[PDB]
Amino acid sequence: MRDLKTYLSVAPVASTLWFAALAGLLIEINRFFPDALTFPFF
Amino acid sequence: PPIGPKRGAKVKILRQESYWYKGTGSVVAVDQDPNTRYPVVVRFNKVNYANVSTNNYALDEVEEVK
Amino acid sequence: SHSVKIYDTCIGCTQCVRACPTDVLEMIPWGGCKAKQIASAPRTEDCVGCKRCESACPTDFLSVRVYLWHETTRSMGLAY
Amino acid sequence: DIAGLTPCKDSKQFAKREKQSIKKLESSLKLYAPDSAPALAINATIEKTKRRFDNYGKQGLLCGADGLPHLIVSGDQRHWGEFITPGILFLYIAGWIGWVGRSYLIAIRDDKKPTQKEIIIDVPLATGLVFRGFSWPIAAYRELLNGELVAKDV
Amino acid sequence: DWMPGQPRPSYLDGSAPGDFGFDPLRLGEVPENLERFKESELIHCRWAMLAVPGILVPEALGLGNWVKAQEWAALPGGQATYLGNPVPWGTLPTILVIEFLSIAFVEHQRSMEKDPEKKKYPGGAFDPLGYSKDPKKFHEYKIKEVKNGRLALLAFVGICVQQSAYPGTGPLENLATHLADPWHNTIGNVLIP
Amino acid sequence: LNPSLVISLSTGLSLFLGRFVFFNFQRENVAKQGLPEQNGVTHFEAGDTRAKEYVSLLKSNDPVGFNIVDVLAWGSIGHIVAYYILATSSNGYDPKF
Amino acid sequence: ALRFPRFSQGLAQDPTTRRIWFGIATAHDFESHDDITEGRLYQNIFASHFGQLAIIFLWTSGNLFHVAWQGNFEAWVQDPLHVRPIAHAIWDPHFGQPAVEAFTRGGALGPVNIAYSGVYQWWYTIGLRTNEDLYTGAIFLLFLSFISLLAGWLHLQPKWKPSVSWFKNAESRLNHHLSGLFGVSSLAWAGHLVHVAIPGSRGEYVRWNNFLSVLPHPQGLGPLFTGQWNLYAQNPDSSNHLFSTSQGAGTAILTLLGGFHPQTQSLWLTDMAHHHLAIAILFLIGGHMYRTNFGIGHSIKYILEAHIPPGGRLGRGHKGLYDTINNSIHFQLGLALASLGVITSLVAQHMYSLPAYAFIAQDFTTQAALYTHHQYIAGFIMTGAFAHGAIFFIRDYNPEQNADNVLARMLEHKEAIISHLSWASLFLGFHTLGLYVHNDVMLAFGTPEKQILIEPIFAQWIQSAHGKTSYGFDVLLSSTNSPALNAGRSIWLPGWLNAINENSNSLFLTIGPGDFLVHHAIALGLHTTTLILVKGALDARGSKLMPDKKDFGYSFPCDGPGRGGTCDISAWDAFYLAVFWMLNTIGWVTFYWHWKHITLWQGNVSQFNESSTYLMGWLRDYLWLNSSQLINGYNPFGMNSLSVWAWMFLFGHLVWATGFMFLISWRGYWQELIETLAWAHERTPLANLIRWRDKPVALSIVQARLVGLVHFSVGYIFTYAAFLIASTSGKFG
Amino acid sequence: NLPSLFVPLVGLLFPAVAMASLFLHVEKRL
Ligand code: CLA
């Protein structure tokens, strides 16, 4: 169990989980706010 | 009398061709035998380009820094 | 032939002589280091320049230095 | 307007691009049935195209002779949303990333094997440090005045 | 002390005339530079104490501002007018060669003499009334001179910057504009246009 | 408007300044400047046969040492200033205020 | 000695073929030859300079000879815009009959090549009119090449070879170069313009027979000694003037009009004569700065010693820099190559925007060829400037004599300089590429409106500052109230403002977002190429990996596989890596220049303004589209005069790809292969009666890098030169 | 007519003489 959690903290797995969460967030941001060449809220 | 610095003290490496030049290391043993041109034994935190972590230096090649 | 030099930073571990593939290095008695021995290059006419000795030196910086010089049949490794 | 450009709400080429794009999608739409799923997909893309063009023309984007939004990064206050404002947002995020990673490297530099926590992440330590980047411009500025940001004599 | 709470620099003791401890950039770090600056400051101070009266006195009369009183040389056939009378040597080449020869000669005499206190306070022929008689009132007048000079230098900066904020104006004309409405005609309108 | 007038006045004033005004400053500055030197020694001593300064032409029975070269230098200043003044007066150029 | 090379014993005693190669590659490295002294060094350099001058004079002499013999110069003067100038004649016995047919052009009897160097326009603008004039210039330069060889030989015998002290006389050399070599030459050129070129440009053929009788000006010389020089500028040529004729001709010889001659579209010949005269007399006065044998002047040593800021932010300033440069010929060559490469690029940027030779702006193939030529020349010169800077640090830099001055301080913080050059290259590279990819993806998905097109508003603001109206920023020269405009309306501003806002020429072309992206690719290329050369020059004496690199020289293979591997660790390898980036940078520069002009000459600047913002547009609308007539130079159905470029086009692709073999594959593979070939020859009957007198070996590691780089560069230059000229001259517009 | 004499004289005879003479000098011994 502790060894399994230590494996999940290795560089590639932490990178995938972190970049997957990051990719999903940016996808939803461009899904609710598509296009946008500017910062429109001024 | 103990020539050179005490063992364990931090030393600023002054040998210009050293991988740890201008850096700092820790003393291991000071060879009190004269005619030994490089008595100061220093151990380093990071390995050099030959994966070596210890080297011998002269007395005028090391400076004691705290 | 290639020039080879030994500097007094040598600790006398006899590693350059073991790695040499053409028997150029020797171990002579000396009084400078703890092992009572230093290296010398008396047969650089057979030296090929592989720098296999420099790859094995633990001194920082190196105590064996191979300065590639005038090429000869022996230094070029020619069997023809 | 600026640099000879005309605002996209005034440009004819800008409106002609919106027309030709929508008419091109409509030309793809006639091939499918009105209740079809490709039809609702193409209709949604058309509505998304209208929304994009309208938003660009509404927020004061300048257009060239090509009918495409050109950005002005000289600092003119009429177009800070085109670079300076998103750039400040980036610099806030970039400083956050660098400051948190720096805090992590400082915290593990005194470990027995500092390389161990660099190839196997200490997630508890990371989760405790990720929110220090929220105040990174302050913590960094104070470390600048106190001599803690730069290593002495390197 | 020019800023209570701040420690004084090491080389500014408080003995020199005008030594209030002002050197944030440490420009007078070198005594050679500091002594040279002590001379150069009095030169700027004295040029300004001659400039400010000459800049605002003709404006009180019918003559225009100092910027328009140096305007005939722009056009070809210029003719200077001291007190409304066209002086015969009003042409620019005449005044230019006259000023070059005289100013270069006199100002170069200051270079050829290094004491270096003669470069600061010469006297002799330049002190006929003999105000340097008492070495206490003479140093008191040194303090009076450097403060009068710094005041005139700050005034010359004001005249030039006001001339930029109102191209083709007079310093006293700007004063009258401020007197018409001090609460609506202030630097705030050129600070916030 | 007269070339001889401008040239004589400009060259006369230039020679006058260089002899009586800008003379001691020029000589003390050329003394502390010194002769150009290669490898810490003059060009001639190093072995340049043609780098020996001509002290015979620098000989002048003038009381202060004004020789031919000083005349040539300050005279070239006077003529260049003279022709600058003449050329600036004949062009008829006028900016716009 | 004993055999070739006689200057290197170690190479002569080489039993392998390596003896020959290294004997050729080290012939001019005088400092490495046996028994070299400082005297022999400067003397061989001196004679080599004379030999080079002889080469240059002979080369120009030959160019005149062929233009006068097989060329079109006499016919080209009559129709400057309808006659294709001839380089020389073609005599290739491999030509088929159609090759003779298609290559016979320009109005000649046999096959000829159309000259694209611009010497026709150059010679017509300076006064040369007949083939006889070109023959006269060729004989004079052939005679000048002769006396160049004469002087070179002369100063190689004793009592004519100068001492090293004479070469180290820097003060006297600068005074003469500024006064005589720079000023007097420019003054005499202004004399040629006002005597032969300007009157030749007004119908008067002034030659050596009648130049003593004609007056360059009706009231000649007189006003020059009075100060009323303006009489030489009273009657310029009318804007409706024909170059070889006199309708509209004037009598002025020194003007400052500022624009172009409307007919020839070249700079005013009076403006050029006045220009050379003004800069000449400025060089003449400036050439009296340093001290010689007359007791006046400056000591460059003392000036360098005096420039030390108190407070020590520059340490000991420039102390010792005089002897540091005056003793190191590599330092002097580094400064010479640096300044020459800058002004070479300056010439490139000005000859296309300010054409000075009559009827050269309409010869579009010539303008493209000239700009490309000088930019690649300047790129190589810049790489050589930094190469010899590193060679100076290894061979000539004395650290104690440069103690704590600006030069040693460069080494003291080498990591700061190299790291920031790396940051700037990373910043430029990351973002410039990213924006290009973003726009590529947008246009892939058919959404051009989502591109990131940044307006180059700072350079647009500068163009408006020069009086251009296309952006309307209302600054000086573009605003009616600024004193910069009022002070110049009398003189150059009429002609200058008339030319800058003409939509035909290339004087400050209109720029858009595409130009913004390409200029940042240029910044990436300059920064990275600078990064490579500077990191190599500063790490040339040593690094943390090899702290004694200065002992191994400038060019060595490596330091072995030890300590992790040390491949390409010398400063020579840094140069070798930077030449790829130089070629890439100049490639970007010239792709930019050629596409903007080839769309301008076609009257279709919108295609460039809309397609240069994404890289698929560069591949499709520039390389692919313009290669049509080129690759059809010869097809299964025949050929035309463009076949010589279609062949050279592929020829350049071959040499370039051949260099990959020397750059990818390395030595040890080929050495073992040659061993298996030596056995084959010794064991083959009949052939074993033939014995090699030099042992076959594989090319050296450094030799391989050089040979691969040379194939790469030759293929680079030849491929682009073939495409450039064929795509431009195929349309001629 | 002159190209029919000088083109082979520099593309055939000249490289032949040049390559042969350079070969003899490079391979020569002392
Ligand atoms: C560097 C200048 C130069 C260059 C690049 C060329 C190039 C060319 N010439 Mg030419 N030539 C030159 C100078 C030059 N020439 C001079 C000064 C003369 C005397 C006026 C001639 C007379 C000449 C004739 C009569 C012919 C050519 C021809 C040709 C073409 C065929 C090649 C050839 O025959 O070789 C050149 C042959 C020569 C006799 C020229 C060499 C003699 C001069 C003095 C150069 C000195 C050579 C020297 C021994 C070595 C030079 C060192 C190094 C720089 C090469 C070719 C494109 C032929 C042609 O038209 O092709 C269709 C041809 O018929 N040339």
Ligand code: CLA
């Ligand atoms: C750069 C100079 C140059 C010149 C002037 C020539 C000239 C010629 N080449 Mg050649 N070639 C060259 C370079 C050159 N080449 C190079 C660098 C290559 C390598 C790519 C080639 C490869 C090549 C091939 C493959 C062929 C030619 C052929 C020919 C001939 C075709 C025209 C013809 O039909 O004539 C007349 C045709 C004849 C057969 C008459 C021969 C001419 C007499 C016998 C010459 C006498 C030689 C003389 C005694 C000694 C010469 C060497 C001496 C200077 C030491 C022609 C004379 C063709 C050829 O030779 O035909 C068989 C051909 O097959 N060339």
Ligand code: CLA
């Ligand atoms: C904490 C991570 C970190 C930090 C604070 C920095 C900081 C810096 N880097 Mg750097 N770098 C990093 C990681 C980092 N780097 C990594 C992993 C690489 C390998 C790809 C590089 C490769 C690199 C190069 C080649 C250069 C720099 C340079 C620089 C300096 C200029 C800014 C810059 O160009 O950054 C740019 C950043 C990158 C190019 C890559 C960054 C990748 C991410 C964003 C950082 C890693 C974050 C880390 C994984 C988070 C850990 C989370 C933790 C809490 C668990 C700057 C002080 C430049 C320099 O020399 O200064 C003049 C320079 O030339 N860096």
Ligand code: CLA
């Ligand atoms: C006036 C300019 C100038 C001068 C005087 C020198 C002088 C010198 N350089 Mg240098 N250099 C220069 C510019 C200059 N360089 C430039 C612009 C570059 C950038 C390309 C270089 C790059 C450079 C390097 C890397 C090196 C030198 C070296 C040297 C020294 C020895 C050169 C030698 O003997 O090798 C002889 C040179 C040759 C035999 C040339 C053969 C290779 C050429 C390029 C092949 C010809 C191309 C192709 C085959 C022809 C066209 C193809 C055809 C089909 C049309 C020497 C003192 C070397 C040195 O000694 O380092 C300490 C050294 O390694 N230079």
Ligand code: CLA
């Ligand atoms: C007034 C006297 C005088 C003159 C005229 C010269 C002239 C020259 N010297 Mg010399 N020298 C002199 C005095 C003089 N020297 C003295 C007194 C000494 C002792 C200290 C020396 C010691 C000396 C040495 C040691 C050397 C020279 C060298 C040279 C030659 C330089 C190379 C060259 O030709 O580039 C030409 C330069 C120009 C044409 C002017 C600059 C060019 C500009 C920057 C660019 C071109 C302008 C324009 C845009 C071009 C348009 C292009 C179009 C025409 C196609 C040159 C001809 C070198 C040499 O001997 O070569 C054999 C060299 O090694 N000199």
Ligand SMILES: CC1=C(/C=C/C(C)=C/C=CC(/C)=C/C=C\C=C(C)/C=C/C=C(C)/C=C/C2=C(C)CCCC2(C)C)C(C)(C)CCC1
């Ligand atoms: C005896 C005597 C005297 C007298 C003296 C005299 C009088 C002298 C002189 C002198 C002089 C009087 C000199 C001069 C001059 C010099 C020079 C040296 C010159 C010059 C010139 C030039 C250099 C020019 C240039 C130019 C040209 C060429 C053209 C263009 C323009 C110009 C101008 C730039 C007395 C009594 C006093 C004293 C005692 C003695």
Ligand code: SF4
């Ligand atoms: S380079 Fe190789 S052959 Fe030469 S001494 Fe070293 S180990 Fe021996």
Ligand SMILES: [Ca+2]
């Ligand atoms: Ca234009």
